[PDB]
Amino acid sequence: TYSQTYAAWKNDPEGFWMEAAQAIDWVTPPGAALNSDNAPLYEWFTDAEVNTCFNAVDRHVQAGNGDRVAIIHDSPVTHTKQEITYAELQERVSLLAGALRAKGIEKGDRVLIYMPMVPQALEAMLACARLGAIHSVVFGGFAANELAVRIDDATPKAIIAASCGIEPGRVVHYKPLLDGAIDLATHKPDFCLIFQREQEVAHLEPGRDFDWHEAQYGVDPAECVPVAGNHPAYILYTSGTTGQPKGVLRPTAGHLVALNWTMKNIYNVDPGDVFWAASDVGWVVGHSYICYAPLIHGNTTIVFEGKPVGTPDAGTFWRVISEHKVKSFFTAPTALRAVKREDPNGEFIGKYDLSHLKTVYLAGERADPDTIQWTMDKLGVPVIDHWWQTETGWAIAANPMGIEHLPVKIGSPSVAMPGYDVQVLDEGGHPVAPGTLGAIAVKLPLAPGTLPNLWQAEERFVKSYLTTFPGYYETGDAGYIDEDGYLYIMARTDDVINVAGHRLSTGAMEEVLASHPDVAECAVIGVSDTLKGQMPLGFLCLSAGVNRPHDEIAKECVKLVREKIGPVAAFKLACVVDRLPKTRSGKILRGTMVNIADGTPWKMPATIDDPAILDEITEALGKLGYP
């Protein structure tokens, strides 16, 4: 039972994690789990030696499963289906690693990856892991400036990219965006590796850019390089301002142990089953559950290049699941809301044999009751909300379907996973009564596989995560826990919003808006949206002496966010106001504007400069349709 599992962890955490560590093939096995020598900066399995690519690929070939399918590429936007076995994947990754080594990549070097959803993206991640290089994958929906920030922070020796990708009605110009990002960056890579795609080919800068295939001619395959248990597996940037980059570090050994454990115990698949997360390699869901966890565990994983609707229609999810015999499906609530908007009766579902589909999982944003119940009703399988974040790399709260299918409380991601002692704390740092809203914190040490630190930013790591609640990790989410231990995730406690499942910094957006020549100051809030959960909304205050029309400035701002942050920011609603409501210390009362926009309750702020400002704000919101 799950109570037995969780109590077994509480009563003997070392024994629990050392046993889970037995599933990993070590070069040097760890002698213990927790390393508390640098508390409160805890680390796990630091004395191990291991290689991630060996456990995700080679080992399965050596076990006789070389002909098992490792990766299925299903790209409706290029009408392409490709299957790659574990033996084929071993050949591709070891030769690609050899090419990276021949051009100077060494253990510890960073390699940025800027690619759409193609199997070559996983091969690049795994090749870096094979060399002990440290990859950093950047979502292809980010703009050249955002890619430049990353280049500067991570100082990669190389960047791997594809020529293009396909979005509905638009080709994404990866290589031109990379070119502009490299020009913007102060740090310059030694070389780039460019995977050409026929939909829009790329220009190579001579001496810098090399063709993916040609660079592999005549190279020897590289071996799996042994790295320390606490060697970084990758750097994954999450929501932030250009001044305060948050490069989440993933430690190699805890990552292997924890992700492997989740595949049966949470996602209820056995080795050889087919698993599909409809996410992107640019996100942690794509790191953990497109690339690493299924391959570590010996599953088939699906790399899907398309959309829940429009590539070609709302049946695509069911066609993919049916055709490839998916057993567990992992997606985001926004994607299913799009499907049921187009196909409310689930007519596409009856067209396909879904008899292999056993469980659906949701994460990345609030899983609303309508979406849960529709999906349960139309698929007749359990639908499992579960909560986690870039920092943890795997579930904090879940329904542990491979251990015990617990009763689902619709609206809740269920219960704390082993390794997470989850508590709701008040302003004063004290646990509150069940059902009381507060900040969700996790008692240190955070579970194996979670971040030990931020890339070259230890001070920012301590401040943002370990300081508000000493002895705890501050998740950044607020919510409550009921009397049975079921979690409910409410809002972020910081500037972050979740748009269509995507974690975005509103502060990043304000910094961009604040650089428009005519804007004196601004505020970006996240308003409620039925389809996408939240949407960003901007308020603009012009400088003195601005005559220009208001909507024309608003357009240049919408366009500046798209150019500086990227299309993924989904920033379409900007408006112009005389002034912003502030407290005595000058803080902008963003929380009050949100409640006004959402038509939710609020109390007039107690230290607001001029209350009449909120009437002006209310008029600006009504012009945009809110509420």
Ligand X SMILES: Nc1ncnc2c1ncn2[C@@H]1O[C@H](COP(=O)(O)O)[C@@H](O)[C@H]1O
For ligand X, the binding residues (CB under 6 A) are: 238, 283-284, 363-367, 385-387, 389-390, 413, 476-477, 489, 492, 498, 503
* Residue 498 annotated in ligand binding: yes
| Smallest distance from ligand X to CB 365, Å | 5
Contacts of ligand COA in 265-294 (CB under 6 A): 279-280, 283, 285
* Residue 364 annotated in ligand binding: yes
Q: Which residue bears the tokens 């990002």?
A: 181
Per the CB < 8 A criterion, the answer to whether 272 and 295 are in contact is no
For residue 362, what are the β-bridge partners? 331, 385
* Residue 186 annotated in ligand binding: no
Identify what 477 binds: ligand COA, ligand X, none; CB under 5 to 8 Å per kind: ligand X
CB-nearer residue toward ligand X: 94 or 423: 423
* Residue 341 annotated in ligand binding: no
| Smallest distance from ligand X to CB 583, Å | 25
| Smallest distance from ligand X to CB 439, Å | 12
* Residue 347 annotated in ligand binding: no
> What is the side-by-side order of every strand in the sheet holding 472-481?
422-425, 438-443, 472-481, 487-492
Residues 6+ apart with CB under 8 A from 448: 17, 20, 33, 44, 45, 253, 254, 257, 258, 419
Rounded Cα distance between 213 and 193, Å, is 9
Per the CB < 8 A criterion, the answer to whether 331 and 323 are in contact is no
Side-chain-side CA neighbours of residue 447 (13 Å):
33
Contacts of ligand COA in 520-539 (CB under 6 A): 532
Structure tokens at 41: 């900066």
Identify what 374 binds: ligand COA, ligand X, none; CB under 5 to 8 Å per kind: none
* Residue 190 annotated in ligand binding: no
Distances (CA, A) of 394 to 260, 389, 569: 10, 7, 24
Contacts of ligand COA in 570-589 (CB under 6 A): 570
Helix (H) or strand (E) holding 59: helix 59-60
User: Judged by CB under 6 A, does residue 364 bind ligand COA?
Assistant: yes
Number of neighbours of residue 607 by Cβ within 10 angstroms = 10
| Smallest distance from ligand X to CB 142, Å | 13
Please select the residue that binds ligand COA; options are 299, 334, 464, 592, rule is CB under 6 A.
334
* Residue 343 annotated in ligand binding: no
User: Judged by CB under 6 A, does residue 424 bind ligand COA?
Assistant: no
Please select the residue that binds ligand COA; options are 271, 567, 588, 618, rule is CB under 6 A.
567
Structure tokens at 132: 């002990």
Task: DSSP for 409-467, please give it.
Answer: -TT---EEPTT--EEEE-TTS-BPPTT--EEEEEESSPPTTS-S-BTT-HHHHHHHHHS
CB-nearer residue toward ligand X: 145 or 389: 389
Rounded Cα distance between 595 and 613, Å, is 15
**Known binding-site residue numbers for CoA:** 167, 170, 280, 307, 532, 562, 572
**Known binding-site residue numbers:** 167, 170, 280, 307, 364, 385-386, 389-390, 477, 492, 498, 503, 532, 562, 572
**Known binding-site residue numbers for AMP:** 364, 385-386, 389-390, 477, 492, 498, 503
Residue numbers at the binding site for ligand COA (CB under 6 A): 140-141, 165, 167, 172, 279-280, 283, 285, 307-308, 332, 334-335, 338, 363-364, 499-501, 532, 567-568, 570
